[PDB]
Amino acid sequence: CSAGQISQTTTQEPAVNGVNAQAGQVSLRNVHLRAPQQTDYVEPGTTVELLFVAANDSSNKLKSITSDVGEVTLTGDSTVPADGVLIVGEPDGQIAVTAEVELTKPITNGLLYDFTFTFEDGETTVAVPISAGEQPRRPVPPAGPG
Amino acid sequence: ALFMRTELAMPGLQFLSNEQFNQLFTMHGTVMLLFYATPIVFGFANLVLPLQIGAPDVAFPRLNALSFWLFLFGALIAIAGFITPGGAADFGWTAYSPLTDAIHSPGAGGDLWIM
Amino acid sequence: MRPEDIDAGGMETVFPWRESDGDGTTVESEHKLTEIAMGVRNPVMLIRIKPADMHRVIKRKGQESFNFGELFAYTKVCSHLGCPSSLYEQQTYRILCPCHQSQFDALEFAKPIFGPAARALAQLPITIDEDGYLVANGDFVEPVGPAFWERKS
Amino acid sequence: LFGLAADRHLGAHIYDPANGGVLLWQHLFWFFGHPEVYIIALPFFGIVSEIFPVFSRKPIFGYTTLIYATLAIAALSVAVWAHHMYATGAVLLPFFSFMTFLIAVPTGIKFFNWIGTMWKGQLTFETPMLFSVGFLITFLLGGLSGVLLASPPLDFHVTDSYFVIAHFHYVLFGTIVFATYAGIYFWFPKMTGRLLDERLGKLHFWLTFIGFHTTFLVQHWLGDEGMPRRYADYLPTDGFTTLNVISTVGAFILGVSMLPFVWNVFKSWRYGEPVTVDDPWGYGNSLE
Amino acid sequence: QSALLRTGKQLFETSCVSCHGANLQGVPDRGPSLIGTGEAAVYFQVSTGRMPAMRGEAQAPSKPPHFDESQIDALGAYVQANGGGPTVPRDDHGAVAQESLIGGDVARGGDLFRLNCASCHNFTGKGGALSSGKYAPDLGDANPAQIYTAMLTGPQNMPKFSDRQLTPDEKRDIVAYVRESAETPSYGGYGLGGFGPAPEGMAMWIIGMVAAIGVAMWIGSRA
Amino acid sequence: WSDALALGWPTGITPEAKLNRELWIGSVIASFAVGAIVWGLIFWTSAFHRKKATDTELPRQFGYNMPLELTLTVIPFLIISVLFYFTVVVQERMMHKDPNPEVVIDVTAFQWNWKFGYQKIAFADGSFDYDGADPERKEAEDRTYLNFDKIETLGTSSEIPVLVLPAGKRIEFVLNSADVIHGFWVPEFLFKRDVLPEPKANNSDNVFQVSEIQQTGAFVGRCTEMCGTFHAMMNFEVRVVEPNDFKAYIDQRNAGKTNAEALAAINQPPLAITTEPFESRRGELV
Amino acid sequence: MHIEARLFEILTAFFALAAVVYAVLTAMFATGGVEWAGTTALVLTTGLTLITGTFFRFVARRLDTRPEDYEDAEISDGAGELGFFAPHSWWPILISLSFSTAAVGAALWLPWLIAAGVAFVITSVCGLVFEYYWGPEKH
């Protein structure tokens, strides 16, 4: 009964703290924003980082990111091989293409912000989250007797 | 057999899956061979053989009774693999190895089949 | 606690805490921290939903703004007989009560899908403070826990 | 089975590939498997051997020789077990081919004895004789296909495809379906005291016969074209699509064929024609 | 290590590529993507035998492992190099830490377990039933590293506890409690499984009442 | 006319296949004869020897005939003897294994895909030499019997693996399995064999060779062992081309061309033209 | 009872011949060794028939011709006293249920169920064996 067309195991999403949206013949995985926070907001003017992996299965594709929270700047080759992938961000844990954001509008962890990823053949909106990686818990000041 | 013949007449998978089809032919194969034929052999034996030889009874009647019940309960235990969320045996009646090892086919249906 | 502490597919139990209590070092705040932990209708489950699954959420006509992005908070008290319905399955998004086997749908407004439960779990509105801590936008807009004769309008 | 349960519950390193357990288990299983298929053959030979003389009004042609045929078939079916393992390329091919050829000699003797029994006598063809004749017709083709599998060159191309499925659904469908039904129709009055209907027991036979030959005949061709067994589905550009439709139609006919039989048994068990004699078949031979 | 990354890739294309993709991007309706999972997930899934899986049902069971320590490390390092994520804690000799994961305070671990983990698992870590065909297993077989990595990643319908939600000091106490509550003998006789009223009731009916009725039948008379 | 007598075997593309087809077609006739001469006997007595209107006495009660029973055990014995002789003759030829193959390729079977490796190439006329043997194989759950090469084609759930072989050359076909038993069957070869985890320890011979392939083209190959869930979804293709195209393809792959654009480099379709990848979804109800 | 004894030693002879042939033919010109799996089975299959054949031979040489073994015997020769047969008993089904319980216990690896099954089996077999030997109640 549990091994029919609808299965509880085959539809399970990976627990990765990121989105796995698709595009034109391109699959984007683990799309997240690095923005180490200190207060309720990350103020405009600060630069933040965009991280993901782009995969296709058979020979090249170009790409460009646009968004509404400031401007996105790319640095690198920014093309995909036949049976390979394009890694942009190096999330904490890995032992060169970089996506930087100027962030005209303030951001906060917990909400989703729309990003547009455009290729030479396909383009999608993603609505990415913010993820903190191997950063330890930040200290909270002690209370009093009350 | 009717189920697996219905889901074999058109190229696409219409209403079955791989796992269900595997269990289905495995259990068809086992039930038809071991729970129908091998038994029906002995039904015809203690129906006319005492009459044919001119005897009033079989050699051990109270042991003759035990065989039928062993048959019925063994068959029920083997078939009751369909109640599990996993399913019954899905490795054919032949049961080749290594496919029935703890690594491959780790389910509880296969265990009930064996026992 | 901060929104950054809990990640996608996690769940935490939270309690209402005011600045007026705190530490529990003295005897005055020692009996104030005990009432919080022994309250019948105090505990709340806070869940974070994966961003991929945010397009299949249904609201409850008056609770359309009770969530802070991809964080939701529900009562931890079963609406059947009051057991802590807290078995959270984070792939199927189901909340299971281990008392009488009623499960609730997290994607919808915690409405029952199986078991002897007939009513949905209550939601608590949440937001953030100027420092970046999680706070409430007021209490529930309905009674929480089991029902009684003079419940509802 | 105990050895396998030991591995699955205790981690007992019995059937490890490194330990030579991939072929140990196959030897152990096929020492059982083939004698098993000869357990459900000889008893149903007995039934037809008992039915022929009654309705033929003539003694069974060859009594001493049939016993020797049975003994030879049974004795031979112990040293023939690796003819199920040809593609493995790990058995002594000559040994299991010659003996498998030899286990096909006394079967022909049994066939010829049956033919000689039903030779030069008044035949009436009631339901038992009709079923027992269907048995002959099916089992001959079953055995003919079975002999082809015994030669390693042909099994190199045929094995583990629907050709074998076609084979063992003829050699197996004669003994435990046709002979079983023959026995049921034969011994129903002796066990109950009622007579099964005749107009309701011929529709059943004809439905079974037509359905069976409609569903299993084209499987040889399927296996020959390159359709392997135990496949859940196939591609549209595979060639074999229409044969599957024919097989399914035949299978549904074979599935609907069984309604009249069950209806007959249900109806005639308590409202059937009463037999008050000692033998309703007239020229019965045995002591029952 | 460069030589360790390539030996972990040849193990992957022979076992894992069918259900997870050639680029770890996931095969639709057979398996998810493996980008951003890290080597903690790999360690947990391969050491306990859950991977590789053999069919799609309600829940993939545990079974004997397919690989050994070296191969496990190779696979973990290959996966870690493709998106990052959590890592298994090591010891001073570069091996997997087992003894160092046991905490000091068992009482704090106990009451953390009772609040966070006793709902799905039992009081002391026995099984528990879930919605439809799913369940929470027994915790009496897992070594400290396995217990640590179970709640770091989130295998299935079990939630994930990040290092910010449960700091890597409370986790040590939790694992200490789990390891201790599994090797402590019963006081007052045979444990009867450790479930409570149901085994107790069955033991009563099948032992006490049987003995009483037998004694009564011996003392009394028939007809 | 041979089409309606071979019951739909493919025609061979190697000498051994043609010899096997000859043996099979010759045997089908020898089995229809003995079927006809028994069906005729059954039909004859079922239509002539019946209970006529004239109710005479019981017929002749004969039950023994020694001469006919004695001359009946010998007639099928000769038939099975001749069949055995021809069987032996054919089977000895189909397993020659000459110790000078011109190209040796490795075949490894794992959970629901194939992987091919060119072990070595050595033409008989000194036109091309290559050795793909790559000693670096790792062990322990040992898995040291497996073989690894420089050039390899890997099968994926979204791409059928295609094997490229020359025409008119010997092929060596060294088979191994990593996990379970699978079946290496090529219908056009009229030949299959089981691939086992540890052939050496199980007293199995896991190498077989052919003489030479007659014609160039694309042929299908299917798994036949019941290896698990996706056992009906484990397919491959063999594409036979001219020797010059073979060398060009080898050079392209040696430069590195993923096996998809090497075919495009030698003016061949990049994908399989006999089969296409199965739909990844479980079925039509999802 | 000579026919019964002869029927077994015929099979003994054939099985011995087959085992001896198989063992030698695999030692020479057969990959590996002796094929120990097939050799083991056929040397005990012969023993199966040998035991029964020897027992039947001894019994046949002990006792003289019976009514069953005489070509021309009368029906009135068999008149006398057959022996004991159980008219009815409900113990077999209990034995089968006990064994089924033990089997289900062993299948799912529940040691408590296995122990209960073994106890039930012992009790049921005790009940079956002692059925026609219990004396009247002593009061």
Ligand SMILES: CCCCCCCCCCCCCCCC(=O)OC[C@H]1O[C@H](O[C@@H]2[C@H](O)[C@@H](O)[C@H](O)[C@@H](O[C@H]3O[C@H](CO)[C@@H](O)[C@H](O)[C@@H]3O)[C@@H]2OP(=O)(O)OC[C@@H](COC(=O)CCCCCCCC[C@H](C)CCCCCCCC)OC(=O)CCCCCCCCCCCCCCC)[C@@H](O)[C@@H](O)[C@@H]1O
């Ligand atoms: C016993 C002999 C008598 C003969 C009668 C019966 C014999 C056989 C006939 C059975 C029919 C074929 C079954 C096999 C097909 C199958 O495998 O199925 C497909 C798939 O289905 C699931 O999904 C559905 C879709 O595929 C998905 O597309 C879809 O999304 C999903 O929708 C749910 O889920 C979504 C989220 O995904 C939500 O969006 C959505 O809202 C919803 O919730 C679907 O599921 P859902 O609708 O639940 O069920 C629907 C399935 C469910 O299967 C079933 O056959 C149900 C199984 C029960 C069978 C009935 C038992 C009858 C009882 C006994 C006769 C009584 C015993 C008495 C003893 C005799 C006493 C003697 C005196 O169709 C049916 O009912 C088929 C109808 C046929 C039944 C007819 C029987 C009743 C008539 C009475 C006759 C009496 C006889 C005698 C009287 C005198 C998937 O997940 C997988 O599992 C599964 O793969």
Ligand SMILES: CCCCCCCCCCCCCCCC(=O)OC[C@H]1O[C@H](O[C@@H]2[C@H](O)[C@@H](O)[C@H](O)[C@@H](O[C@H]3O[C@H](CO)[C@@H](O)[C@H](O)[C@@H]3O)[C@@H]2OP(=O)(O)OC[C@@H](COC(=O)CCCCCCCC[C@H](C)CCCCCCCC)OC(=O)CCCCCCCCCCCCCCC)[C@@H](O)[C@@H](O)[C@@H]1O
């Ligand atoms: C009037 C008389 C009244 C008195 C009668 C009392 C008699 C019974 C016992 C005797 C008293 C001895 C006192 C000393 C106590 C002692 O010194 O204490 C030992 C320890 O022992 C257990 O430790 C096992 C290991 O030693 C540990 O290493 C391990 O950790 C631990 O594992 C647990 O913990 C893990 C977490 O890590 C989990 O992973 C894991 O799963 C598990 O939970 C182990 O436990 P466990 O498996 O229980 O052992 C199984 C028991 C198994 O008992 C039993 O026979 C079962 C008794 C109850 C049966 C009643 C059930 C009723 C069922 C019904 C029939 C159902 C069907 C009917 C209904 C329907 C009807 C219609 C059909 O023995 C075995 O091993 C194998 C079987 C051999 C025992 C046989 C003795 C008696 C049998 C009676 C008959 C004799 C016949 C021959 C048999 C061989 C744990 O308890 C520990 O606390 C405890 O410390």
Ligand code: HEA
């Ligand atoms: C069930 C009953 C049954 C019977 C009676 C037989 C009888 C025979 N079987 Fe068996 N067989 C099976 C059941 C049976 N079989 C099953 C279930 C399988 C598949 C198991 C699995 O793998 O899943 C199987 C598989 C099987 C294989 C392995 C095929 C493979 O896996 O690829 C072989 C190979 O040697 C074989 C051969 C034979 C032979 C030679 C006979 C002979 O007994 C038949 C001989 C009959 C005749 C010869 C006709 C009468 C003779 C004459 C009229 C005289 C004519 C004389 C000449 C032609 C010389 N059968």
Ligand SMILES: CC(C)=CCC/C(C)=C/CC/C(C)=C/CC/C(C)=C/CC/C(C)=C\CC/C(C)=C/CC/C(C)=C/CC/C(C)=C/CC/C(C)=C/CC1=C(C)C(=O)c2ccccc2C1=O
């Ligand atoms: C919820 C509900 C309504 C209940 C019914 C559910 C249901 C369908 C029941 C099936 C249970 C089984 C046996 C499942 C396996 C599959 C199967 C074999 C199905 C049926 C087979 C069949 C039809 C024919 C076989 C014939 C036959 C008589 C079978 C025997 C099966 C038996 C007797 C098994 C026991 C059944 C059962 C439900 C027992 C409950 C026992 C309980 C509740 C005890 C709990 C218990 C536990 C859990 C311990 O850990 C423990 C540890 C140490 C000592 C004691 C105990 C202990 O008592």
Ligand code: HEC
């Ligand atoms: C198809 C069947 C396979 C194969 C051949 C492998 N895996 Fe595994 N795997 C599969 C599924 C459907 C799932 C998801 C549901 C569940 O977890 O049971 C997984 C899961 C994993 C994970 C967990 C990832 C997560 O946290 O998101 C890992 C780490 C994993 N699988 C590893 C893995 C490895 C290393 C394999 C090669 C040996 C492998 N899987 C094979 C389905 C399948």
Ligand code: HEC
């Ligand atoms: C309900 C959901 C929960 C909760 C709240 C916890 N666990 Fe447990 N757990 C659960 C499931 C359904 C599974 C199985 C997943 C799989 O097999 O892929 C698990 C698994 C574990 C394991 C590993 C299993 C083992 O090898 O024994 C461990 C060690 C484990 N869970 C422990 C654990 C702890 C310490 C928890 C609270 C801190 C906890 N779980 C919560 C179900 C659930």
Ligand code: FES
């Ligand atoms: S208390 Fe939650 S379901 Fe009854």
Ligand SMILES: [Ca+2]
């Ligand atoms: Ca279909």
Ligand SMILES: [Cu+2]
């Ligand atoms: Cu055979």
Ligand SMILES: [Cu+2]
């Ligand atoms: Cu395969």
Ligand SMILES: [Cu+2]
């Ligand atoms: Cu396969």
Ligand SMILES: [Mg+2]
């Ligand atoms: Mg095969």
